[PDB]
């Protein structure tokens, strides 16, 4: 409940993690840098989204080269550049899942060790409405939560190559 994992998650909530509302509902979204952010492809964003309740025009959208979609928003604010934290070193890592959508606002779940199975799998009974949650640890952003099987959750892996 404390330690640097919690501080990292809270700072991400402060600067980079938002609620993105599409016609399919509320999802957690991750700002990467500039005006680029990421959401689950299942969210099916249109030409406008709500970013923490504010209507924002989508300048561009595209799927990645895995259930993740990149949006460039028509927004004033820039995201803190968190690309340096994107990591694929996840073994031996007790991770947190940070969600900010639906009733799970400012929510930091400690999901335990994570492994590849390919997606990242973590043993924690996930509820619905947490899609888009950021899988991370201190100084490390691993992926975006895109589903579960009722006893495990699964995250699509983030990679530095996706963002030039």
């Amino acid at each position: 409940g404390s330690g640097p994992n919690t501080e990292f998650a809270l700072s991400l909530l402060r600067k980079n993690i938002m609620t993105i509302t599409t016609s399919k509902g509320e999802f957690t979204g991750l700002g990467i840098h500039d005006r680029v952010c990421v959401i689950p492809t299942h969210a099916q964003p249109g030409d406008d989204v709500l970013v923490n309740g504010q209507k924002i025009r989508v300048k561009d959208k595209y799927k990645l080269v895995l259930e993740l979609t990149v949006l460039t928003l028509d927004r004033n604010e820039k995201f803190r550049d968190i690309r340096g934290f994107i990591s694929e070193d996840l073994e031996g890592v007790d991770a947190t899942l940070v969600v900010h959508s639906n009733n799970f606002t400012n929510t930091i779940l400690e999901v335990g060790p994570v492994t590849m199975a390919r997606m990242i799998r973590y043993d924690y009974a996930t509820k619905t409405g947490q899609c888009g949650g950021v899988l991370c640890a201190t100084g490390k952003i691993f992926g975006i939560h895109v589903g579960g099987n009722g006893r495990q959750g699964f995250s699509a892996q983030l990679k530095k190559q996706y963002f030039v």
Partner: antibody
């Protein structure tokens, strides 16, 4: 990893001192940094910290109200400014990197060389 | 505030001796504890974090143990280069409080 601090300072009571700490630029934009001081012959004392990537600021209660910690990206440096100097502020001031990245609150894995501040009286 | 206290505060031992230093936190800090070594006239240096994880490069004669409130740093065979002051520090959350330090000398 390199943390290069500014040079020795001599100050009178009631004034203020600013100490700088320079790092590479990759490190500045990803890590947190802490200020720790050490009076002559005494122990280490945590003063505060900043993670520039997230504007995370933390201050020790003992210095709250007379300590300002800042960052400049162009200079890739973090700073501490201590005001209302008293002679018990005579100490070596250390800049130190918090480990792993993105946080102030962590173990400190690299230390700058230290800056002696002498407050006369 | 919060207290980090070490025991003993100083000791003198012989080369080859087993040396044990303890640290007590007034509040539980789980395993968010680091140990630092400050050799005379040098800057402090990280020896151990997460209470028992050796920083890379640190000799294996240094070991740490404990969780919660009671922690121990052990030097299994005291070497001349180990003369120093050793500090514990919590980082469960701010403040990142240091213990008062334990001065280790050799007769």
């Amino acid at each position: 990893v390199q943390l290069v601090q500014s040079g020795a300072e001599v100050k009178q009571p009631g004034s203020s001192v600013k100490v700088s700490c320079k790092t590479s630029g990759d490190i500045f934009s990803t890590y947190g940094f802490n200020w720790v001081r050490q009076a002559p012959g005494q122990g280490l004392e945590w003063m505060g910290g900043i993670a520039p990537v997230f504007d995370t600021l933390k201050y020790a209660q003992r210095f709250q109200g007379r300590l300002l910690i800042t960052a400049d990206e162009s200079a890739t440096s973090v700073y501490m400014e201590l005001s209302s100097l008293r002679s018990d502020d005579t100490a070596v001031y250390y800049c130190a990197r918090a480990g792993q990245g993105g946080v102030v609150g962590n173990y400190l894995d690299y230390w700058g060389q230290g800056t002696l501040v002498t407050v006369s009286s | 505030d919060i207290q980090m206290t070490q025991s003993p505060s100083s000791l003198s031992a012989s080369v080859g001796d087993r040396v044990t230093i303890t640290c007590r936190a007034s509040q539980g800090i789980s395993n968010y504890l680091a140990w630092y070594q400050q050799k005379p006239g040098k800057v402090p240096k990280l020896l151990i974090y997460a209470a028992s994880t050796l920083q890379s490069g640190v000799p294996s004669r240094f070991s740490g143990s404990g969780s919660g409130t009671d922690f121990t740093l052990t030097i299994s065979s005291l070497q001349p280069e180990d003369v120093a002051t050793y500090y514990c520090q919590k980082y469960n959350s701010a403040p990142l409080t240091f213990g008062q330090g334990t001065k280790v000398d050799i007769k």
